[PDB]
């Protein structure tokens, strides 16, 4: 009867995602004026696509594929999603057509028009942008080929940065008990996130989960705002650990277990006893997600 939600972090590495809308001879990335600075943003859609790709990669059946069409990219290989089983991974069976299900009496099921599961937010960077640049050559394909050569060869610029990406999870819904196996597989796939942004093959970036820590009581989201972290030095502490210490009996530390895999490195014992007696295990995020899923599916 609870809806636990988490927050992930990623190891620093040069950025790869490019957001298009190229101006002049450079491809740029959208920025937000958080405090008058620049930051990197990855839209939730690409992450949803990566999750669906992982679910189709692990053998879970589905009815939606986007293939490399010769003309322009499109999504196909779908049918009537009358059963939510074996279709749509219990999420977003969108439909707008009027001639649907022979006017719906033969379906005898909800059209899945707006059933939304696994709501998710959009990732933000931790460091500003300082106007970097890497050169680009793109020589003409040939001087004699039958295939065209773009009539010229032009050199261009790029920009990259090294930055982590904090991320709220916002998993909700006590009704996802029909297929516990599907939920466990989805959680494992999230634990095995990689190649989330379809940026490009070279200079690739991957979302390696690290210090993925958040829990809450069977209430709605509150408490720690799922943000407010430093530049990878020490992030969860000044965010919420002082509040947890000051509210060891006010905010429930029994269910809200410890935070940060870094506890494996400094101040392991002090955090081990004088914080709380809850399941503060942190060895691999895989087993953490496994036993958290077991507890969540228990009640």
């Amino acid at each position: 009867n609870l809806n636990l939600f988490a927050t992930i972090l990623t190891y620093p590495a040069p950025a790869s995602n490019y957001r298009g809308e190229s101006e002049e001879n450079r491809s740029v990335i959208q920025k937000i004026l958080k405090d008058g600075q620049k930051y990197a943003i990855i839209s939730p859609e690409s992450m949803r696509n990566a999750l669906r790709e992982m679910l189709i990669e692990l053998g879970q059946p589905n009815n939606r594929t986007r293939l490399h069409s010769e003309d322009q990219l499109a999504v196909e290989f779908k049918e009537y999603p009358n059963p939510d089983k074996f279709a749509d991974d219990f999420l977003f069976g969108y439909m707008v057509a009027q001639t649907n299900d022979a006017k719906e009496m033969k379906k005898l099921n909800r059209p899945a028009k707006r059933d939304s599961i696994f709501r998710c937010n959009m990732a933000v960077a931790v460091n500003p942008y300082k106007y970097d640049t890497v050169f680009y050559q793109s020589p003409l394909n040939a001087g004699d080929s039958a295939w065209k050569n773009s009539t010229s060869s032009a050199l261009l610029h790029r920009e990259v940065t090294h930055t982590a990406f904090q991320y709220p999870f916002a998993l909700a819904g006590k009704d996802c008990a029909a297929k516990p196996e599907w939920v466990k597989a989805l959680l494992q796939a999230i634990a095995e996130l990689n190649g989330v942004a379809g940026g490009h093959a070279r200079a690739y970036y991957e979302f390696a989960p690290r210090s993925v820590v958040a829990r809450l009581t069977p209430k709605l989201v509150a408490g720690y705002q799922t943000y407010g972290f430093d530049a990878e030095g020490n992030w969860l502490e000044l965010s919420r650990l002082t509040a947890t210490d000051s509210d060891n009996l006010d905010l429930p530390a029994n269910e809200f277990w410890l935070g940060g895999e870094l506890v494996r490195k400094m101040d392991q014992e002090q955090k081990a006893q004088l914080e709380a007696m809850g399941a503060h295990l942190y060895a691999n995020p895989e087993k953490l997600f496994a036993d958290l899923a077991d507890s969540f599916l228990g009640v």
């Binding site: 002049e24 707008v96 009027q98 106007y131 640049t133």
Partner: protein, 467 residues
């Protein structure tokens, strides 16, 4: 028969709805100032009378013949011949009352308005189907068209009824980006939207390339939110008749703007000057409540929008126009601080940090001097005259001990070290000699030099002007 209509500005949800009322009022007034209109009134008994003209409400009475005459005036078009640079002719609308007020050199302002009308609002062939057929008619010969008027007149009988919108007007009531559902509207509102384009102001934007060519693309549309209908219709006849006649190639000088906000703010400057000239009008807010800015561009068969804005016309930006006229004339990158001014944005121009984006673009292409030497000085700190005297004394002492093309050598010498100063984003050596060449301000040197940022990029700029 006789048809009477009444309208109010307290229920219109869109600014274009209000603009169309003033547009049609101006069209009716223009009709009242034409001898052939009176001839038609005498012969065919044309009825077109404005009953109520006040601050808020409006009334009108008209017959079928009056509607036909209004359609003939508004939708008058002619044919123009263009040569490629094998002949081709282009149908162009007359423009209505615009020809009656444009006395500029060659009516170049009219040319800009006509191009936008055919190009974006009328991209759909519908303008051409109606426009081409209408073209070449002679009012003095009694030529008229009434096939389309009959449908509109029949529709106008049930003004309370509903009918779908179209892409000729404001777009969006088509697919609606979600669900196959139409829009809600009423007939007489759609009819009023047939004349909002005339009141609109047109500006031509452009994008800088590496070579500095003014690559014009798209258009900027300004839409005013009329507060007092009675007062608004009086100032405009002189506002549009006092436009600057300066011409630059195929476009007027004022027609060239960088950011969309330039066109809207420039309109406020023009109106207040005419307010100072046309008595009976006070503040800008008493005439205009809001200003709409639209950026549009047509590519192939589709029209792409870039920005839609509507924000708080004010009167404290008058000095800004004079601040940029005497400043932006020489360079081309001073527009950045102009964009800077337009809870923590009141006096943000004091810092005016226009160094980041401006310097990166102009690195390679526009590098091809001391005009911009002092520009980066204020950005380096984020004190000036003292360093100038120090540098002057060192060179004077050097030549004293030893006792027409130096400008070109001066430009090259500083460029060699200004460029390297840009990349830094030894420095205590040359100043060490200069100080040696030389006291409260002397104490302040220690506190203004020990900062790492000051050491990195501040102290190594002013001394370069010597040699």
């Amino acid at each position: 028969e006789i048809l009477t209509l009444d309208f109010n500005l307290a229920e219109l949800p869109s600014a274009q709805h209000r603009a169309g009322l003033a547009g049609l009022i101006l069209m009716i007034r223009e009709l009242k100032k034409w001898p052939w209109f009176k001839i038609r009134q005498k012969e065919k008994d044309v009825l077109l009378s404005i009953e109520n003209l006040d601050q808020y409400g409006a009334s009108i009475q008209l017959n079928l013949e009056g509607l036909i005459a209004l359609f003939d005036l508004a939708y008058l078009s002619f044919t123009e011949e263009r040569k490629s640079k094998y002949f081709y002719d282009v149908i162009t609308p007359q423009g209505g009352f615009l020809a009656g007020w444009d006395k500029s050199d060659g009516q170049i302002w009219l040319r800009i308005w006509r191009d936008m009308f055919w190009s974006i609002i009328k991209g759909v062939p519908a303008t051409r189907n109606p426009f081409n057929n209408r073209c070449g008619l002679n009012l003095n010969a009694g030529d008229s068209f009434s096939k389309d008027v009959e449908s509109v007149w029949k529709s106008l009988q049930n003004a309370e009824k509903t009918t779908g919108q179209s892409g000729a007007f404001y777009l969006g009531a088509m697919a609606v980006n979600a669900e196959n559902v139409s829009t809600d509207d009423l007939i007489k509102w759609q009819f009023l939207l047939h004349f909002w384009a005339f009141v609109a102001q047109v500006y031509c934007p452009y994008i800088l390339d590496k070579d500095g060519k003014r690559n014009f693309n798209g258009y900027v549309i300004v839409i005013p939110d009329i507060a007092n209908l009675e007062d608004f219709c009086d100032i405009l006849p002189d506002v549009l008749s006092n436009r600057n006649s300066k011409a630059f190639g195929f476009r007027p000088q004022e027609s060239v703007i960088d950011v969309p906000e330039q066109g809207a703010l420039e309109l406020l400057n023009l109106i207040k000057q005419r307010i100072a000239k046309k008595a009976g009008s006070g503040l800008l807010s008493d005439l205009i409540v809001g200003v709409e800015v639209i950026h549009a561009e047509k590519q192939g068969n589709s029209i792409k929008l870039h920005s839609v804005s509507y924000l708080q016309p004010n009167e404290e930006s008058v000095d800004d126009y004079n601040a940029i006229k005497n400043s932006y004339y020489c360079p081309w990158f001073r527009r950045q601080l102009l964009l800077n001014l337009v809870l923590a944005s009141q006096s943000w121009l004091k810092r005016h940090p226009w160094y980041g984006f401006g310097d990166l673009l102009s690195r390679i292409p526009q590098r091809w001097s001391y005009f911009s030497h002092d520009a980066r000085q204020l950005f380096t700190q984020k004190y000036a005259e003292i360093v100038y005297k120090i540098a002057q004394g060192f060179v004077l002492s050097k030549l004293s001990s030893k006792h027409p093309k130096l400008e070109r050598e001066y430009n090259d010498k500083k460029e060699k070290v200004v460029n390297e100063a840009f990349l830094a984003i030894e420095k205590q050596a040359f100043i060490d000699y200069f100080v040696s060449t030389l006291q409260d301000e002397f104490v302040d040197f220690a506190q203004k030099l020990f900062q790492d940022t000051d050491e990195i990029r501040s102290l190594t700029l002013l001394a370069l002007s010597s040699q």
